[PDB]
């Protein structure tokens, strides 16, 4: 289980694409849920919960609220799991 950066990005995009409210085509690494997409705060909470369930590690609430982007989620997961490539 190397859990490379590309794998993390692919899995996060997987979870987000399987998210009905997000339209898959416009979903991008830099698509802020609050601004670019139409997700509200509770949708932010749900997506963070989905990510933590997918990777099996819990994101602390203080850090969780500030992600606001898929690439942010990917990099935070990389930092927590010490992924350097």
């Amino acid at each position: 289980p190397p859990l490379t950066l590309e794998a993390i990005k692919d899995r996060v995009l997987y979870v987000l694409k399987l998210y009905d409210k997000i339209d898959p085509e416009k979903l991008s690494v830099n698509s802020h849920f609050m601004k670019d997409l139409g997700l509200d705060s509770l949708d932010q909470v749900e997506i963070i919960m989905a990510m933590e369930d997918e990777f099996g590690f819990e994101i602390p609430d203080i850090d969780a609220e500030k992600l606001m982007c898929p690439q942010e989620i990917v990099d935070y997961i990389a930092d927590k799991k010490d992924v350097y490539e």
């Binding site: 509770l42 909470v45 919960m49 203080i62």
Partner: protein, 178 residues
């Protein structure tokens, strides 16, 4: 990696934390995914019902009552992620984590076994030793006259300057050191 805390939690943040706690405890009670999804959609509807209450007093009373309901309905043994606080694997690898300063005390024979690594370590030591003065100066400049009023630290303003107080965060022991 943890962000600096704020003095108080905003009403929105408290509601979000209650939402997360309720969903997790519901998942603990609703072991099977389908029942969890149904009741989770129910909970989302419950929050949406008073999402737009104008009166802040009423919303605060609603939050208080919701917290009371949560305490009554909390799962006695809520699911904890294995590596999370209270989890089965929390701090399991703490002993294996060893501080970086220990390597300095290695016998020269031991350091000989890994020459390239210790050369790179000397390079990193040089970087830290050079950067310390500029980091202190920047921290002094940005700091307000009364003092630092938050734990947040400024990023590197100019190229060639490392983020202030970067050593321990960057060189923290690996999560699974072995």
């Amino acid at each position: 990696a943890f962000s600096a805390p704020a003095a108080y939690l905003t009403h929105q943040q408290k509601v979000l934390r209650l939402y997360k706690r309720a969903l997790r405890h519901l998942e603990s009670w609703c072991v099977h995914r389908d029942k969890y999804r149904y009741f989770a959609c129910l909970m989302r509807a419950r929050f949406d019902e008073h999402k737009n209450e104008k009166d802040m007093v009423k919303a605060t009373q609603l939050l208080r009552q919701a917290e009371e309901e949560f305490w009554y309905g909390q799962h006695p043994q809520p699911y904890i992620f294995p590596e999370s606080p209270g989890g089965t694997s929390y701090e399991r690898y703490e002993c294996y984590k060893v501080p970086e300063w220990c390597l300095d005390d290695w016998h020269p024979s031991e350091k000989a076994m890994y020459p390239d690594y210790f050369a790179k370590r000397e390079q990193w030591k040089r970087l830290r030793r050079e950067s310390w003065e500029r980091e202190v100066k920047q921290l002094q400049e940005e700091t307000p006259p009364g003092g630092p009023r938050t734990e947040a630290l400024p990023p590197a303003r100019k190229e060639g300057d490392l983020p202030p107080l970067w050593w321990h965060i960057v060189t923290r022991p690996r999560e699974r050191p072995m």
